[PDB]
């Protein structure tokens, strides 16, 4: 008889001095907040029930009311930032951290969920939860020989809460906290459950989004092989975070990019650059562009894996954002590549699609394309072959696009097009 209660009855029951009346009222409140039709969180907050739930969180003798209040506060902290702030202002962080060590698995799981919802609000509440000392109990909950002995849902919730503790920036998670969490996160990254894998991979992608110091921190744990293995997975929820993490890693030093390459990541890109999902193609092309901005030996490893034809294909037909990432990749290739590599580019058939891409409203893509065409023309000069390249660019209908860009609102575009016209077409 706790279904479809009024906030008035719940308030009257909780305000009584009868622990059982309070328990039934809190259960009614939980059921009201556990509905799928927009829970009445604001009504429960305006009634002043959060402090009473926070107090119930500490009644060890009555574990049912602890569980009910934890569920209710978890659902309240799942809403807007203001509702999570109301939960935190009730003093719920320390109460949930204390319940993390409860002998009842369901109560501890609800505490993990509540702390995860709180930390997911932003950097401020995340760092506050970390200051209150939640990392040590959370990791102690996972300190077991084999993770497979834990319940699937419990482990998934723990993984999600940790990933939220690794999330958000400005500021990024504390360095000590990341060092304390990484071992368990890597242990979870090798688990067999797809949801745990996806969440731990998202956490790793979070930790690798930043300065090269954090990327080095993550890479020192030896996760690049596992990340590449997950990159070749069949489930998109696992491939997406893996690709994001690989991309973040290759945005760092050339040595970290080489660590990625040595793990065999390039061998997976033939299918990533042809993935039916647009986001996968876009982020794979972005990763390829960051790889082509590396050393010449890395460009040569890209060439050896036969990925230049796939970039040509992406430039020929793909979403405009993927095509722009491919143009950036080609520009970096030509800017850092050897003459033989810049010639292999044309031998693969880049000129025609790269020229067809010049007839776009986006100005930055035009600047990138014209820089790439300047670099290729310089590579041709270096072999006394500019004339044949010019005839090629004029045959495919590009010269018309180059001379049309001589009039353009942006200045650098028309300046570069005029330079090219007067320097290689006379």
């Amino acid at each position: 008889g706790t279904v479809n209660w009024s906030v008035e009855d719940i308030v009257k029951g909780i305000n009584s001095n009868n622990l059982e009346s309070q328990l039934q009222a809190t259960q009614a409140a939980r059921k009201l907040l556990s509905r799928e039709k927009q829970p009445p969180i604001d009504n429960i907050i305006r009634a002043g029930l959060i402090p009473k739930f926070v107090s119930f969180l500490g009644k060890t003798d009555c574990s049912p009311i602890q569980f009910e209040s934890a569920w209710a506060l978890t659902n309240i902290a799942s809403g807007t930032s203001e509702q999570t702030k109301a939960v935190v202002d009730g003093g719920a962080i320390p109460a949930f951290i204390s319940l993390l060590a409860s002998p009842h698995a369901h109560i501890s799981e609800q505490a993990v969920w509540a702390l995860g919802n709180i930390a997911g609000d932003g950097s401020a509440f995340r760092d506050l939860v970390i200051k209150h000392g939640a990392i040590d109990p959370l990791l102690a909950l996972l300190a077991v020989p084999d993770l497979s002995t834990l319940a699937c849902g419990y482990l998934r919730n723990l993984t999600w809460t940790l990933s939220n503790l690794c999330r958000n920036k400005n500021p990024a998670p504390p360095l000590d906290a990341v060092e304390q969490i990484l071992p368990t996160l890597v242990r979870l990254l090798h688990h067999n459950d797809p949801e745990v894998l996806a969440d731990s991979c998202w956490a790793i992608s979070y930790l690798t989004d930043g300065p090269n110091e954090r990327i080095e921190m993550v890479v020192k744990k030896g996760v690049v092989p596992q990340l590449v293995k997950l990159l070749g997975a069949t489930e998109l929820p696992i491939v997406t975070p893996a690709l994001r993490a690989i991309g973040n890693i290759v945005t760092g030093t050339d040595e970290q990019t080489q660590k990625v390459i040595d793990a065999g990541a390039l061998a997976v890109f033939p299918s990533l650059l042809t993935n039916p999902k647009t986001n996968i193609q876009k982020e794979a092309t972005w990763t390829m562009s960051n790889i082509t901005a590396g050393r010449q030996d890395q460009i040569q490893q890209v060439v050896n894996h036969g990925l230049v034809p796939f970039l040509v294909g992406v430039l020929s037909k793909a979403d405009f954002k993927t095509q722009k990432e491919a143009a950036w990749a080609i520009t970096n290739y030509t800017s850092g590549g050897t003459v033989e590599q810049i010639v292999y580019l044309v031998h693969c058939g880049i000129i025609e699609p790269l020229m067809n891409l010049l007839s776009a409203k986006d100005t930055k893509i035009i600047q990138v394309i014209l820089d790439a065409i300047s670099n290729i023309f310089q590579a041709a000069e270096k072999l006394g072959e500019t004339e044949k390249l010019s005839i090629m660019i004029e045959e495919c209908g590009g010269l018309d696009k180059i001379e049309a860009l001589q009039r353009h609102e942006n200045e650098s575009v028309y300046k570069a097009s005029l330079n090219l016209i007067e320097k290689y077409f006379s």
Partner: peptide
């Protein structure tokens, strides 16, 4: 030069 970009897990979850 290395550039930056521009299925994620729920930031907050409601039990049931």
């Amino acid at each position: 030069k290395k550039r930056v970009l521009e299925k994620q897990p729920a930031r907050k979850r409601l039990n049931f």
